[PDB]
Design an enzyme around this catalytic site. Structure first.
Site, short mmCIF file in Angstrom:
data_model
loop_
_atom_site.label_atom_id
_atom_site.label_comp_id
_atom_site.label_asym_id
_atom_site.label_seq_id
_atom_site.Cartn_x
_atom_site.Cartn_y
_atom_site.Cartn_z
N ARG A 1 1.09 6.83 0.41
CA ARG A 1 0.30 5.78 1.07
C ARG A 1 -1.13 5.80 0.47
NH1 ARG A 1 -2.72 2.48 3.18
NH2 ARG A 1 -2.60 1.66 5.29
N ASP B 1 0.80 -1.28 0.00
CA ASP B 1 0.00 0.00 0.00
C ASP B 1 0.82 1.32 0.00
OD1 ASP B 1 0.73 0.02 2.72
OD2 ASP B 1 -1.31 -0.68 3.40
N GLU C 1 1.43 -6.31 6.07
CA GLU C 1 2.87 -6.05 5.98
C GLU C 1 3.56 -7.23 5.31
OE1 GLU C 1 3.90 -2.87 7.06
OE2 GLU C 1 1.82 -2.44 7.69
N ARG D 1 3.93 11.02 4.39
CA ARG D 1 3.49 10.30 3.18
C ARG D 1 2.35 11.00 2.50
NH1 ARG D 1 2.61 4.38 5.69
NH2 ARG D 1 0.98 5.65 6.70
N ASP E 1 -5.72 -1.15 3.52
CA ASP E 1 -4.62 -1.65 4.31
C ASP E 1 -4.30 -2.97 3.72
OD1 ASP E 1 -2.84 -1.55 6.47
OD2 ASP E 1 -4.29 -2.70 7.76
N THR E 2 -3.08 -3.08 3.22
CA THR E 2 -2.51 -4.38 2.86
C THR E 2 -1.73 -4.96 4.06
OG1 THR E 2 -0.57 -3.20 1.95
CG2 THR E 2 -2.29 -3.94 0.34
C1 LIG Z 1 -4.08 5.35 5.23
C2 LIG Z 1 -3.81 6.35 6.33
C3 LIG Z 1 -2.93 6.03 7.36
N1 LIG Z 1 -2.61 6.96 8.30
C4 LIG Z 1 -1.73 6.68 9.45
C5 LIG Z 1 -2.65 6.04 10.50
C6 LIG Z 1 -1.81 4.98 11.11
O1 LIG Z 1 -1.06 5.55 12.20
P1 LIG Z 1 -0.14 4.56 13.11
O2 LIG Z 1 1.21 4.51 12.42
O3 LIG Z 1 0.00 5.40 14.35
O4 LIG Z 1 -0.77 3.23 13.33
C7 LIG Z 1 -0.87 4.62 9.94
C8 LIG Z 1 -1.20 3.34 9.18
O5 LIG Z 1 -0.37 3.32 8.02
P2 LIG Z 1 0.27 1.90 7.69
O6 LIG Z 1 -0.83 0.89 7.50
O7 LIG Z 1 1.08 2.14 6.43
O8 LIG Z 1 1.10 1.49 8.91
O9 LIG Z 1 -0.81 5.70 9.06
C9 LIG Z 1 -3.27 8.23 8.27
O10 LIG Z 1 -3.00 9.09 9.15
N2 LIG Z 1 -4.08 8.60 7.28
C10 LIG Z 1 -4.45 7.69 6.34
O11 LIG Z 1 -5.26 8.04 5.47
CA LIG Z 2 -0.24 -1.66 5.78
#
Ligand SMILES: Cc1cn([C@H]2C[C@H](OP(=O)(O)O)[C@@H](COP(=O)(O)O)O2)c(=O)[nH]c1=O
Ligand SMILES: [Ca+2]
Length: 129
Positions: A29, A15, A37, A75, A34-35
């Site tokens: 991102r 993702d 890891e 991101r 959510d894919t």
């Molecule tokens: C997809 C997305 C993720 N995020 C943040 C929330 C999550 O915070 P945390 O890192 O605190 O869990 C994280 C999940 O991304 P990843 O799934 O790439 O880890 O990225 C956002 O803030 N906005 C979004 O639209």
């Molecule tokens: Ca992910």
């Protein structure tokens, strides 16, 4: 919403991807998904699916939603298109991502993606197997 140009710099995972946008390298991102890891089940498969889709594309485009365009990690948050086909949606339709992270005001394609997820679940694809 509108599509804007970008070019692939490098695959990252299911993702996220490194793209050049307005001439600057950014990690993007994918919105609303959510894919797993790479370390988790179907992680490799999601990464590969994403990597193939973007590297086979002639034209990559990014589409920002109405809200936040960068997350807390810097991101870019976007819907990404590979020759007109939305990567986010294709991942969900294949059972390689869940609809997730649906924050109000950046959720324009929510129902499109949930429709894909329902079809994936019905077919018992990948994560829904
Ligand atoms: C997809 C997305 C993720 N995020 C943040 C929330 C999550 O915070 P945390 O890192 O605190 O869990 C994280 C999940 O991304 P990843 O799934 O790439 O880890 O990225 C956002 O803030 N906005 C979004 O639209
Ligand atoms: Ca992910």
């Amino acid at each position: 919403l509108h599509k804007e140009p970008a070019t692939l710099i490098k695959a990252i995972d299911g993702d996220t991807v490194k793209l050049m946008y307005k001439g600057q390298p950014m990690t993007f991102r994918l919105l609303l998904v959510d894919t797993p890891e790479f370390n988790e089940k179907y992680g490799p498969e999601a990464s590969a699916f994403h990597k193939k889709m973007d590297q086979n594309a002639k034209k990559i485009e990014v589409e920002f939603d109405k809200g936040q365009r960068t997350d807390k990690y810097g991101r870019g948050l976007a819907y990404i298109y590979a020759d007109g086909k939305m990567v986010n949606e294709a991942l969900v339709r294949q059972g390689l991502a869940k609809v997730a992270y649906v924050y109000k005001g950046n959720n324009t394609h929510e129902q499109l993606l949930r429709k894909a997820e329902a079809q994936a679940k019905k077919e018992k694809l990948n994560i829904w197997s």
